[PDB]
């Protein structure tokens, strides 16, 4: 009603894939102890 | 079946759930009337 978040203001979850993150990464970071660490910023899908 | 889950520990929820209208479907939701009901969900349970 007047209380609650308005239904038009709610943006619905839409992205429900079965598989994603199909990317190539090259470990070009400086190697400490023979080990290269790449930090990736990824965006999670709407699936639960 | 739209299943609403309530995984809160000890808080029951009063939820108004509404189905949006689509011209490709024929339900009770029209253009000038909303198909919304308000239900109560106990904690650690679900309601269909």
């Amino acid at each position: 009603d007047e209380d609650i978040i308005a239904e038009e203001n709610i943006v619905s979850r839409s992205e429900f894939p079965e598989s994603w993150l199909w990317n190539v990464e090259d470990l070009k970071e400086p190697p400490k102890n023979g080990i290269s660490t790449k930090l990736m910023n990824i965006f999670l899908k709407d699936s639960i | 079946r739209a299943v609403l889950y309530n995984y809160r520990q000890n808080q029951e929820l009063k939820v108004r759930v509404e189905l949006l209208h689509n011209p490709a479907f024929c339900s009770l939701a029209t253009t000038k009337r909303r198909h919304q009901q308000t239900v109560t969900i106990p904690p650690k349970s679900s309601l269909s």
């Binding site: 038009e8 943006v11 839409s14 994603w20 199909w22 190539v24 965006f43 | 949006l20 253009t31 000038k32």
Partner: protein, 712 residues
Amino acid sequence: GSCSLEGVEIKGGSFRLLQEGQALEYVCPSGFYPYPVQTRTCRSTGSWSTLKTQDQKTVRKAECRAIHCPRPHDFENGEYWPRSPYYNVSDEISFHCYDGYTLRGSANRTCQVNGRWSGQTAICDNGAGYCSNPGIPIGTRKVGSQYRLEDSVTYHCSRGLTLRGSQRRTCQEGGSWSGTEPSCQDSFMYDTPQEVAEAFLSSLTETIEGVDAGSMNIYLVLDGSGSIGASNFTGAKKCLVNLIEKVASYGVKPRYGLVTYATYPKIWVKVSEADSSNADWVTKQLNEINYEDHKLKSGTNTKKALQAVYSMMSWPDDVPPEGWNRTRHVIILMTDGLHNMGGDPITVIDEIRDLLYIGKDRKNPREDYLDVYVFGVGPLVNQVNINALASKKDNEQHVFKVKDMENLEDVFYQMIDESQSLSLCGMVWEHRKGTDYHKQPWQAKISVIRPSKGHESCMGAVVSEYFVLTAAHCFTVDDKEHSIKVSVGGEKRDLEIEVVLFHPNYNINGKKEAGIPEFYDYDVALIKLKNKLKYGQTIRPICLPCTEGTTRALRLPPTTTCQQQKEELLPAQDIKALFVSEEEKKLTRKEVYIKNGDKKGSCERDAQYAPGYDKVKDISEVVTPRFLCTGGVSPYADPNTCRGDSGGPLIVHKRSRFIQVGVISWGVVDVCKNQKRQKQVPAHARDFHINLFQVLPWLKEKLQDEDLGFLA
């Protein structure tokens, strides 16, 4: 009486009274839109119309809310970042596809002040369909993952948004989708005055340079309804005067038709008059019109006006006319979309296309013979009705929405300052005299007589008034200019040349130390003729990559770089192309596929079977990145190039225009023996060409004084 102005003000803005106080228009500041209602109608009860949304929700008070760009609710074959519930002004999102996919369009897009995203639409495509991926414009939803031939896709906008463009697109023969790309418009997006006249002239000049021979009709319809105003008609009269002089500035004098309507149509100038082609006489009629009778009959009967346009172009049992399959028709109309009399005007539009033989065939659509442009005058505009009347041609806009009238007068003085680079290259109009050299005007036939070695029968391409582009191995340094004769246009005589300009990197015997007798790297040359070529119906040039005329021929913005054009003509897929061959003293076309995607590797490794190349170690030593590869068995059986077709153009047919992207160089297997075509070709019979995108600094230097307009 007039409505009371109580309880109708808006939180954070003002208003202005239009239509003599019978309609208010909310004026929010720059960056805001009035919540739902843009305007309010004065119902005759004392109170204004309720603040109803697109969902018909009763809002009590109005408020100027912030402008959001439409969120991407659907995107396939990749990942866009960041995801947000809404996007403010000047937000940026970027696109990036998965492995094994090519990104075309703008990778970095920005939300502007007009509620639209900048650049072109980002598309992740794999190159497996006959047509390309139509992609998802931001705000839409695409239904249809198959991109084969005869397939279709349907589009839908979000809630409260109006579709502009084609709702359904169909893949046609040749690799071109029907209709136009959609774009979700709102109740406040409008169009900037620069974007209106920029797209309108790039459509209009296409259906003018094909008329080039007197064979074009232009119909002018003006709305005189009471919902526009008496003060808004005379400002539209002075706008239409500027339109006629811009059309007559191209040397073409078409026939004009002036009809102003409201409740009834009134014909001022008919196209069936002896003075309608005189462009100065129609301008004299435009000042003599008076709108006092249309003000008495206040109404919007759009259907009865278009029935008068049908009666002007129809013939009363005249029995096929001489310009029935050769006359371009252009219909220009201004309206507000709010028609209430006569009925649906779309039923008259379908009768016009049936009379002009448009859509009644599968091999000849004839979509270039009817263009319809609709302009939106006021804020009171039904964007659905104006979109269904206008035409939907590929890579082009025909629907426009502007406000306050005076800015539409600002787009007509701006378009005459804008100069359009007219391109006579690649123009083949269907004349019923279909002998060869009419279908292929650019094709040059080159003959070199050598002392007892024989006659060298090569080919070339007319690129300018003085230059003919061909291969470099047809000539040597010993061949003099008196022993080289070039013939164009099917003419019996031979034209004499001035100089043969070889590329500075050409060296055919530069690999004899490595055991390789031939070396066709940089196999291009120019032939500067002695006499200037006169352009007509049988001799016309062919367009070249990264020029000003190539940019307008693809309907791209003029800010298109040379790297953006290489992403357009030669993408990383199998590209449909064609070349010209001579079959029994008659010229014919052979459609091939350019292996530029994942089949580029299987095509290039077949060069080991060439004569002399049977013992070459590294296969990439003889195939530089200056090469393109055609022919083979996958995905189709392409016809192979002969020895006499050497030096010819490798042409790409896109949107009824022909662009050369390569020069024919050499082949592995000689399937032509000057007796027939050897009907049992092998599977590795590939042919190689010279990529014109790699020889651009040499072509720009040698053709700097030719008015071609190369890009920086």
